[PDB]
């Protein structure tokens, strides 16, 4: 099917505590494969997936160079942001960057991304057409005019449609045995009385990859959207993911409720009933 590559970086300023903390990570789909942490001892881009370990010394040399140069770029951007927003240099602020591309089943380019957030909210982002920018406020409009003048978008468009998807297609090949997998969820139900008249029904999905999944509760064939507790999809730590969805049900009426599970790894969607 389709695949994605994302790089994220996070810069956090810490006045009177040194340079901003800088953490960068790289993913293919839901699989992390590199990281850099300014507080780590190596001061190197490091491997975090087996299939990237095969890259030569030059790869790590160049990746380290770019990511370290980026930490300094976003370091200055944090300072620039202070000016734009007229904020004191006593406060701690955050700058997040995301970049990457999507490809379809055929390996063809599908989508490119390049966007920033300041203190947890949109700052600037490359529009889907890869030719124009979305600025979130008056400060980002300043940056937008700068990037328009410098033709940043045409540079990044070429890179996203070329180098990025080229790199992604390569990683997908190198990590073929693991990255192309689709582990179906193993499903089960738990049931716990909470009083003399109500019971909890919890629908579980475990051991699945990729993380994308849909759990839905129905009562007599109707979505129970408003009464269901859904937890965020979570990593098992072994490369797979977990999720559950629960509903509180009148005792003796369990059989009216059905849990529906949808996932890329299933031949057909599953239905669970207590």
């Amino acid at each position: 099917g389709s695949h994605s590559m994302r790089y994220f970086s996070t810069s956090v300023s810490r006045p009177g505590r040194g340079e901003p903390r800088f953490i960068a990570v790289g993913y293919v789909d839901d699989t992390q494969f590199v990281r850099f942490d300014s507080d780590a001892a190596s001061q190197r881009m490091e491997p975090r997936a087996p299939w990237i370990e095969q890259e030569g010394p030059e790869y790590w040399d160049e990746e380290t160079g770019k990511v370290k140069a980026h930490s300094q770029t976003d370091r200055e951007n944090l300072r620039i942001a202070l000016r734009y927003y007229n904020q004191s240099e006593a406060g701690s602020h955050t700058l997040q960057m995301m970049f990457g591309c999507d490809v379809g089943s055929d390996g063809r380019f599908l989508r490119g991304y390049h966007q920033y957030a300041y203190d947890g909210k949109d700052y600037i982002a490359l529009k889907e057409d890869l030719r124009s920018w979305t600025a979130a406020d008056m400060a980002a409009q300043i940056t937008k005019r700068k990037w328009e003048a410098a033709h940043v978008a045409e540079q990044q468009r070429a890179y996203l449609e070329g180098t990025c998807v080229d790199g992604l297609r390569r990683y997908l090949e190198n990590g073929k045995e693991t990255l192309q997998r689709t582990d179906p969820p193993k499903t089960h139900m738990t049931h716990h009385p909470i009083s003399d008249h109500e019971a909890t029904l919890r629908c579980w999905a475990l051991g699945f990859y990729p993380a994308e999944i849909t759990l839905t509760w129905q009562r007599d064939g109707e979505d129970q959207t408003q009464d269901t507790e859904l937890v965020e999809t979570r990593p098992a730590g072994d490369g797979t993911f977990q999720k559950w969805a629960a509903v509180v049900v009148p005792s003796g009426e369990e059989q009216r409720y059905t849990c529906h599970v949808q996932h890329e790894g299933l031949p057909k969607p599953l239905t669970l009933r207590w």
Partner: peptide, 10 residues
């Protein structure tokens, strides 16, 4: 591969 970000100055 990590992007080329020299030009990403605010």
């Amino acid at each position: 591969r990590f992007p080329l970000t020299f030009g990403w100055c605010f």
